[PDB]
């Protein structure tokens, strides 16, 4: 069937595992610097376990 | 005091965990692709906080200043010490013969 082509588009692939959670963590944006660093360190612990 | 050496080095531990927070909110943009084009206060906060105890420290790590006036480290200096000439040295004292042989 491929023989016949009419039209097609090129679709990204969906983000991998290793870096889904560097667009979830982000936006958050709290209103006191303390909860900033607290899941900022938390991300840092998370990526050294990994 | 050497304490201060010690904190120098943790201004720039202090320095590099920025490095690695901005690279990884870079990263946050080349997979948000959004209107943000800012870095987040607090990184900024800390960085700079960072580079002023380093550089506070480090002005302390240079060192100690030294006078200028030639006759600073020259008042402590007795007379019984400049006329020793190391070079022209005599053995032919009262020392060899008093002290043991
Ligand atoms: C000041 C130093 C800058 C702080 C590091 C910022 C940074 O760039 O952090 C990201 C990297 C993680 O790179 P990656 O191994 O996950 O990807 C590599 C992909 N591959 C394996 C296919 C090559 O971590 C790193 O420290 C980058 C490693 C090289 C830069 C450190 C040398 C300066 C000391």
Same mark, same amino acid.
């Given at each position: 069937?491929?023989?016949?082509?009419?039209?097609?588009?090129?679709?990204?692939l969906?983000?991998?595992?290793a870096?889904?959670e560097?667009?979830?963590?982000?936006?958050?944006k709290?209103?006191?610097?303390?909860?900033?660093?607290?899941?900022?360190?938390?991300?840092?612990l998370?990526?050294?376990?990994? | 005091?050497?304490l201060?050496?010690?904190?120098?080095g943790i201004?720039?531990f202090?320095?590099?965990?920025?490095?690695?927070?901005?690279?990884?909110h870079?990263?946050?943009?080349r %997979?948000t692709e959004?209107?943000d084009?800012? %870095?987040?206060?607090?990184?900024?906060?800390?960085?700079? %906080?960072?580079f002023?105890?380093?550089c506070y420290?480090?002005?302390?790590?240079?060192?100690?200043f030294?006078?200028?006036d030639?006759?600073?480290?020259?008042?402590?200096?007795?007379?019984?010490?400049?006329?020793?000439?190391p070079?022209?040295?005599?053995?032919?004292h009262?020392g060899?013969?008093?002290?043991?042989?």
């Amino acid at each position: 069937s491929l023989a016949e082509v009419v039209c097609l588009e090129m679709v990204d692939l969906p983000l991998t595992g290793a870096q889904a959670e560097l667009e979830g963590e982000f936006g958050k944006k709290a209103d006191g610097l303390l909860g900033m660093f607290l899941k900022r360190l938390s991300s840092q612990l998370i990526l050294l376990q990994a | 005091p050497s304490l201060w050496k010690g904190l120098v080095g943790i201004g720039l531990f202090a320095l590099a965990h920025a490095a690695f927070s901005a690279a990884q909110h870079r990263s946050y943009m080349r %997979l948000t692709e959004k209107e943000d084009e800012s %870095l987040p206060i607090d990184i900024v906060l800390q960085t700079l %906080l960072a580079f002023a105890v380093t550089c506070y420290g480090i002005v302390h790590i240079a060192g100690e200043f030294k006078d200028m006036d030639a006759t600073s480290e020259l008042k402590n200096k007795t007379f019984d010490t400049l006329r020793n000439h190391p070079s022209f040295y005599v053995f032919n004292h009262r020392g060899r013969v008093l002290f043991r042989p």
